[PDB]
């Protein structure tokens, strides 16, 4: 409900992409349900797979092998890089930047290639499963990941150059969407939504 | 016949214009949209082929149904397809769009976008790789190249 | 007459283009295709209902400043007078009055919206 | 033979607009680590023609709620006005030499705005109405500062005749004299042409397509052609006003080449800005122009009024 | 200057493709005028080239044949035209070309690769592969 | 453990004030962004010339399903139906009967390429390596029915792609 | 690479160049090999009309010099 | 890359960084597609004695 272009009331209508995932999981075995979690958040598939695997392992009272755990943490951080690339670049594109999107999506393609080499699926791999990881890293993947990581910082710096200090970008975002820390906590916000307000909470540190 | 030759050449020109300039509408439902963006990304840039994403349905020529089509979203998809001017072509991307895929037996999923809107090219995969989507788009371009509207007009 | 001929030629080209666009293509117009566009779902109300203008004051002030734009355009020929002192004084008087008006509206929270 | 001249101005300009679309697509792609259109024709040369053919062979839809008369009139007005504004420009010799060509261009630019407002209102769609209101706000923001900057710069010319700008800048570019006014003028031209970072009327990210959301096929092609032609024409106006060129009366081709190159550079700058910067909020655009550009323009207008007097440099009226 | 060297390289590209006619042919067919080492050519006619200097993803490319399986492919080319043996080399699954490392020879393996046949009379049509489950009674042919 | 983004205070010395004033009036940062875009203009584009150039893929790629054979020519499938059981989307329909030789073979093997999620299961699950997701990804069709594969279609795909499938399995069989 | 952009720019540049050259040469052809006279004030138009009268062919560009005298 | 020295200088100056050192496009630095066969290690439970499943 807009008076002019001012939003008097914003009412989100959802369910346009409700596929009954939770109902379907009940009809599937634990392994069969694993691919569902990849689809829940298309941008961050492996992290959802890891969350499901952790839940199933805790119920199973079984411990993943250490190399499996380190592979999970590594690919989770790669998934975080993908997710944040998508979020920041699509946010800029919606506010009109439209170049960092392509710039960073090239790197997203490279990280997809890492996904494909490990699993054979560029996205939605079933790599992380309860009890560990399906297959060991193909030989040569780690050095390629090193090659990518050594250069990724320059790309992030160029994106900052495009957006961080721009007058227009700062105007579009500097004081929009302010959320109080207490309001953020009560409303159930998590992650950067809480940390942006100044609350110091990251489950990776508080609850590794 | 000279008339047949003129009709064939004009049909060639029209089909070339339509296939060379294919403007998909900015319609992405689900994970398959991400592979579509990667197709728009530099590696497989679709702008080289003349495929430019245009938001307005009336300024678009192709609808790519990327992602699962829920029963809630189906009327909006049909509305967007109808509001799209013709000639209009529909490409169904991903198993979810093609036949329902992982959520085929869900209450809230349409078991294929063919039920709601006519589909020209089906791109298999879940998610289909960006190269697969580009292959499907080029296949649609060849399908347009094979069209014989003016020849049929002359023969009718 | 040259300007009239040029205007006619341009308008005729545009009208011919519109005619060719509305007659060369094939059409299958049906109700759902010609319905209004509301991002897929149907519109709630009309698009002819009132649309509040949060910058009305700025628009009226724009009219009043376009008047000053009109008053200042003769300045290039004014600089050709022999009484350049009076001309300069009056031109700076008008520009300072425009500046004063802008400053007043600004300080009185008139250039802000809503 | 004047009709031949009118066609010579019109037809080549439209082809220039068509190839400008290709140039923009390729320049943005290369600035984005991509290759612009290359498949259709050698190095993508035939892409424009394919786009024009596709649009004009596509069904045009008349919205059920639309006011047909204005809906059709608006694209005609936009294209005709876009073509008309090219007439007074000296390249080097103008097609129509007017004593007050600059005011003519200002009035014609004012008239073109109604095409956007009429299109948006006739569409009878909420997004189109929002785009039309944004266009109204944009004109409110930019018109006064544009006029004041043009007056300040033309005070040195001594007239509103476009042709006399060449003589005034015979020895030096006027950008050296008035580089701040030049900066504000370039931004104001960006605003007038509704180009990024001020692409508010269309505003695809925020408004699905803005005023043209309900336009398809030929009318949309006409709106696009008007937009690009206005971009080129405004950049040419900037080149004439500030980046003057040498004119040898016996050989006009040299001036024409220099002018065309400068205008191409300015249009490329337009595409460059569209690629680089994000989009402004229309409240922010109006605030920028009224609170920042307008006071500096008033001060510089006072300065440019005084300077010819205090430096005994009043330009000749004739 | 390096600019003169670049122009000379462009002329070398013109010569390497067989002259102006070959240069234009390649430019129109594939939109790329690079000249690269010819690793091999399949039976269908597709020629495969390698330029390791070019960055990954462009080091290997294939020039599709003008005629395959009775279809004119001078303008209409498709990815499926690539035979399986060269598919892994082209897609970088392997670093060894089929010529250097031939695939294992099996009788059942097809000898002629078919491209995507959708939209053609050879298109696959689904059908049930199982026989009728329930058999009905056949009425006697005598009146009684 | 925690880092402060923002939380920096600008200097108030005349030089810093003049620098920030120049940035505001002279648009320095926008010019820096423009320079970045120009540098990208002069960098080599990343577009690959598809179809002539194809993107990298690994031997573990999951594409079109295929039914393999033994070197003899006998079909590897032994109608275990465990690969049907593990299918997350129930995209595989299998029926079997003792064949004339007496062997356990599949009378019906159907994979609906429209219900499949290309998970890669039943390649791990199938005990005899019979069913394999091959390298092919460009199997788009103009009709929905073309994507409902049959045992004949799957066996034809296996025969078509066996040369590549065997090499990829050889490459990745030790990792499995 | 970036040079591939240049051909479209060249086509656009030629299209833009056509108008000014066409205008100049058309003016030359219509006005007898000389630039079209600029009449921004009534005096110059009066001069043009007087030249039209003097020429005898009702064309102002036709210039009669000392030869016509005496 | 294959850029001429002039273009390299122009791009580096425009960026403010040495682009040549870190290039987004991938060259011979990437790992070879064909790799030596692996020998994956076995896990803790691969023992012939004292490995009764009740313990683990
Ligand atoms: S087909 Fe697969 S990738 Fe595409 S939307 Fe459905 S689950 Fe996501
Ligand atoms: S491996 Fe494949 S063919 Fe063999 S029994 Fe299992 S599903 Fe059937
Ligand atoms: S790879 Fe295909 S056949 Fe195998 S389980 Fe997944 S969807 Fe079913």
């Amino acid at each position: 409900e807009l008076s002019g272009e001012m939003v008097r009331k914003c009412d989100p209508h959802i369910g346009l992409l409700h596929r009954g995932t939770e109902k379907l999981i009940e009809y599937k075995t634990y392994l069969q349900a694993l691919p569902y979690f990849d689809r829940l958040d298309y941008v961050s598939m492996m992290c959802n797979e890891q969350a499901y695997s952790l839940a199933v392992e805790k119920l199973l009272n079984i411990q993943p092998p250490p190399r499996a755990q380190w592979i999970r943490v590594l690919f989770g951080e790669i998934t975080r890089l993908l997710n944040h690339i998508m979020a920041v670049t699509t946010h800029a594109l919606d506010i009109g930047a439209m170049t960092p999107f392509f710039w960073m999506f090239e790197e997203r393609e490279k990280m997809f290639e890492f996904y494909e080499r490990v699993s054979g699926a560029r996205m939605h791999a079933a790599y992380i499963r309860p009890g560990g990881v399906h297959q060991d890293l193909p030989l040569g993947l780690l050095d390629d990941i090193y090659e990518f990581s050594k250069n990724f910082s320059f790309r992030i710096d160029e994106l900052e150059e495009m957006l961080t200090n721009n007058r227009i970008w700062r105007n579009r975002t500097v004081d929009i969407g302010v959320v109080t820390a207490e309001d953020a906590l009560n409303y159930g916000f998590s992650g950067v939504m809480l940390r942006g307000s100044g609350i110091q909470w990251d489950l990776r540190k508080t609850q590794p | 016949s000279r008339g047949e030759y003129v009709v064939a050449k004009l049909d060639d020109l029209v089909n070339w214009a339509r296939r060379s300039s294919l403007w998909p509408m900015t319609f992405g439902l689900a994970c398959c949209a991400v592979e579509m963006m990667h197709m728009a990304a530099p590696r497989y840039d679709m702008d080289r082929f003349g495929v430019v994403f245009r938001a307005s349905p009336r300024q678009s020529d192709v609808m790519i149904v990327a992602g699962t089509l829920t029963n809630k979203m189906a009327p909006a998809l049909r509305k967007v397809y109808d509001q799209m001017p013709e000639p209009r072509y529909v490409v169904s991307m991903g198993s979810c769009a093609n036949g329902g895929g992982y959520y085929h037996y869900s209450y809230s999923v349409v078991r294929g976008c063919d039920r709601i809107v006519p589909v020209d090219i089906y791109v298999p995969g879940c998610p289909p790789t960006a190269e697969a989507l580009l292959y499907g788009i080029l296949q649609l371009q060849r399908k347009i190249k094979r069209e014989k509207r003016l020849r049929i007009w002359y023969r009718r | 007459m040259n300007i009239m001929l040029t205007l006619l030629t341009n308008v005729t080209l545009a009208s011919l283009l519109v005619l060719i666009a509305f007659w060369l293509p094939q059409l299958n117009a049906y109700s759902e295709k010609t319905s209004p566009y509301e991002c897929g779902f149907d519109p709630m109300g009309s698009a002819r209902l009132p649309f509040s203008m949060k910058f009305f004051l700025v628009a009226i002030t724009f009219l009043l400043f376009d008047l000053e734009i009109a008053l200042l355009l003769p300045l290039p020929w004014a600089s050709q007078t022999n009484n350049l002192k009076t001309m300069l004084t009056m031109a700076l008087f008008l520009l300072i009055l425009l500046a004063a008006s802008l400053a007043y509206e600004w300080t009185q929270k008139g250039l802000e919206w809503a | 033979m004047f009709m031949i001249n009118i066609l010579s101005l019109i037809i080549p300009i439209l082809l220039a607009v068509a190839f400008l679309t290709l140039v923009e697509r390729k320049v943005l792609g290369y600035m984005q680590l991509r290759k612009g259109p290359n498949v259709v024709g050698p190095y993508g040369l035939l892409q424009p023609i394919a786009d024009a053919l596709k649009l004009f062979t596509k069904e045009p839809l008349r919205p059920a709620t639309s006011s047909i008369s204005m809906f059709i009139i608006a694209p005609i007005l936009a294209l005709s006005l876009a073509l008309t504004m090219w007439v007074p420009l000296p390249m080097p010799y103008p097609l129509i030499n007017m004593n007050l060509g600059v005011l003519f261009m200002l009035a014609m630019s004012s008239l073109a705005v109604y095409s956007i407002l009429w299109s948006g209102w006739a569409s009878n769609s909420k997004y189109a109405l929002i785009g039309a209101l944004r266009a109204v706000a944009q004109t409110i923001s930019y018109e006064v500062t544009l006029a004041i900057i043009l007056l300040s710069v033309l005070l040195m010319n001594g007239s509103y005749t476009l042709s006399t700008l060449i003589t005034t800048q015979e020895h030096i570019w006027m950008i050296f004299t008035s580089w701040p006014l030049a900066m504000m003028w370039f931004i104001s031209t960006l605003a007038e042409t509704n180009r990024a970072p001020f692409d508010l009327t269309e505003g695809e990210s925020e408004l699905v397509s803005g005023f043209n959301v309900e336009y398809a096929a030929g009318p949309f092609a006409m709106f696009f052609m008007a937009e690009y032609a206005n971009i080129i024409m405004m950049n040419a106006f900037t080149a004439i006003l500030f980046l003057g060129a040498s004119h040898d009366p016996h050989t006009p081709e040299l001036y024409t080449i220099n002018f065309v190159l400068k205008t191409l550079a300015l249009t490329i700058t337009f595409l460059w800005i569209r690629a680089s910067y994000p989009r402004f909020r229309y409240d922010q655009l109006m605030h920028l122009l009224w609170k920042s550009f307008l006071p500096l323009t008033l001060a510089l207008c006072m300065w440019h009024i005084s300077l010819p007097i205090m430096t005994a440099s009043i330009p000749p009226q004739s | 200057m390096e600019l003169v060297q670049v122009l000379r390289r462009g002329l070398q590209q013109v010569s390497g493709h067989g002259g102006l006619r070959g240069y234009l042919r390649v430019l129109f067919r594939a939109n790329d005028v690079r000249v690269g080492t010819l690793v091999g050519e399949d039976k269908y006619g597709n020629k495969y080239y390698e330029d390791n200097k070019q960055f990954f993803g462009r080091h290997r490319w294939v020039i599709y044949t003008t005629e395959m399986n009775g279809r004119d492919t001078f303008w209409d080319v498709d990815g499926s035209m690539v035979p399986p043996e060269w598919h892994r080399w082209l897609h970088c699954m392997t670093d060894d070309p089929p010529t250097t490392k031939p695939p294992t020879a099996r009788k059942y393996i097809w000898t002629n690769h078919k491209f995507n046949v959708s939209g053609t009379p050879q298109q696959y049509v689904p059908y049930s592969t199982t026989r009728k489950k329930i058999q009905e009674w056949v009425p006697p042919s005598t009146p009684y | 453990t925690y880092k402060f983004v923002n939380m920096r205070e600008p200097s108030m010395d005349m030089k810093s004030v003049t620098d920030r004033a120049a940035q505001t009036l002279l648009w320095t940062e926008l010019v820096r962004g423009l320079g970045m875009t120009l540098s990208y203009l002069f960098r080599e584009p990343a577009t690959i010339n598809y179809p002539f150039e194809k993107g990298p893929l690994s031997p573990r790629f999951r594409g079109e399903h295929a039914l393999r054979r033994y070197p003899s020519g006998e079909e590897r499938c032994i109608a275990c139906k465990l690969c049907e059981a593990v299918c997350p989307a129930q995209a595989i329909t299998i029926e079997a009967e003792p064949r004339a030789d007496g062997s356990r073979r599949t009378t019906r093997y159907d994979i609906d390429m429209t219900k499949c999620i290309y998970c890669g299961f039943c390649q791990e699950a199938c005990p005899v390596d019979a069913i394999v997701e091959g390298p092919n990804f460009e199997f788009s069709t103009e009709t929905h029915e073309e994507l409902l594969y049959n045992k004949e279609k799957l066996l034809n795909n296996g025969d078509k792609w066996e040369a590549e499938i065997a090499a990829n399995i050889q490459a990745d069989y030790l990792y499995r | 690479m970036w040079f591939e952009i240049l051909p479209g720019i060249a086509v656009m540049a030629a299209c833009l160049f056509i108008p000014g050259m066409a205008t100049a040469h058309i003016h030359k052809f219509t006005n007898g090999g000389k630039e079209k006279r600029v009449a921004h004030f009534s005096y110059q138009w009066n001069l043009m009309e007087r030249d039209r009268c003097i020429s005898g062919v009702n064309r102002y560009h036709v210039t009669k010099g000392l030869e016509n005298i005496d | 890359a294959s850029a001429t020295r002039v273009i390299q200088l122009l791009r580096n100056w425009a960026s403010g960084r040495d682009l040549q050192a870190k290039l987004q496009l991938r060259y011979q630095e990437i790992s070879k597609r064909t790799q030596p066969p692996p020998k994956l290690p076995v896990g803790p439970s691969h023992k012939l004695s004292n490995n009764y499943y009740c313990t683990r």
Side-chain angles (χ1 to χ4, degrees), chain F residues 67 76-84 92 94 106 109 122 125-131:
Chain F
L67 268 170
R76 289 177 164 269
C77 208
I78 36 66
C80 61
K81 295 181 181 57
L82 124 157
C83 329
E84 168 177 346
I92 296 182
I94 297 180
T106 46
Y109 196 108
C122 316
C126 252
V128 294
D129 295 15
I131 202 62

Side-chain angles (χ1 to χ4, degrees), chain D residues 237-265:
Chain D
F237 192 9
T238 75
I240 297 175
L241 237 180
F242 302 98
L243 312 180
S246 172
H247 175 45
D248 178 57
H250 301 279
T251 50
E253 355 280 345
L254 302 176
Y255 173 92
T256 311
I257 306 174
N258 210 7
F259 157 84
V260 172
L261 293 179
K262 303 182 188 298
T263 64
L264 291 176

